[PDB]
Scaffold this motif. Structure first.
Motif: not given
Ligand code: A1H3Z
Length: 210
Positions: A9-35
């Protein structure tokens, strides 16, 4: 001296969070994400000479060398990722930044193979004032089909060392600018390795200097 960054970050702009992920087709019924990769920001950082990595990024216009000459120098970071590749679902990317000031941001993400741009996504985000700070949310952007296909291919290689040879040539540059002024606010180069199965995603953040 001091005045050197302690996070991405800088004084004008800090990163808070970044993530790239996948939620499988069954995440609907029981939730899960892979980072695949993840940074969370809720002693100064080590530095790396930017001249050493020019050849891993596009040149001519919006490439590393001209962005650094344009500056400002203190806005340049390098993230090394150890990516967790151990998992037709949903592939997404979520970023959040914070500032003291109200801006509209342009966020460009340029995927590169052998230092040459292959895909590029450019989004804008107006600020939302919250408890003191402004906040910028780019949550759940769908991943480019390029990356999604890359990941599936990478996943199938029979040896970590092959994954790392292939990743040696695969890079990402994120450029965030004040859309109104055109001032550059944050520039982040990403280089990649694969982590081992039961170690998950890790990272290490460097300042880029010259
Ligand atoms: C909408 C988009 O496509 C933007 C994508 C993006 C911006 N910054 C990134 C940093 C890392 C990343 O992927 C992690 C990865 C890649 C390849 C192999 C293992 C892990 C993706 C992105």
């Amino acid at each position: 001296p001091a005045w050197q960054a302690r996070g991405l970050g800088t004084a004008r702009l800090q990163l808070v969070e970044f993530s790239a992920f996948v939620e499988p087709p069954d995440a609907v019924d029981s939730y899960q994400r892979h980072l695949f990769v993840h940074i969370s920001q809720h002693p100064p950082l080590e530095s790396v000479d930017v001249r050493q990595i020019y050849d891993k990024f596009p040149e001519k216009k919006g490439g590393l060398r001209e962005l650094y000459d344009r500056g400002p120098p203190h806005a340049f970071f390098l993230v090394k990722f150890w990516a967790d590749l151990n998992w037709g679902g949903f592939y997404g990317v979520s970023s959040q930044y914070e500032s003291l000031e109200h801006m509209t941001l342009t966020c460009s993400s340029k995927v590169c193979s052998f230092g040459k741009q292959v895909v590029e996504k450019v989004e804008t985000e107006r600020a939302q004032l919250e408890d003191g700070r402004f906040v910028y949310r780019l949550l759940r952007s769908p991943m480019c089909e390029y990356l999604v296909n890359f990941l599936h291919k990478l996943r199938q290689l029979p040896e970590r060392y092959m994954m790392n040879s292939v990743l040696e040539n695969f890079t990402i540059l994120q450029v965030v600018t004040n859309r109104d002024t055109q001032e550059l606010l944050l520039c982040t180069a990403y280089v990649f390795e694969v982590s081992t199965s039961e170690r998950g995603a890790q990272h290490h953040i460097y300042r880029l200097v010259r």
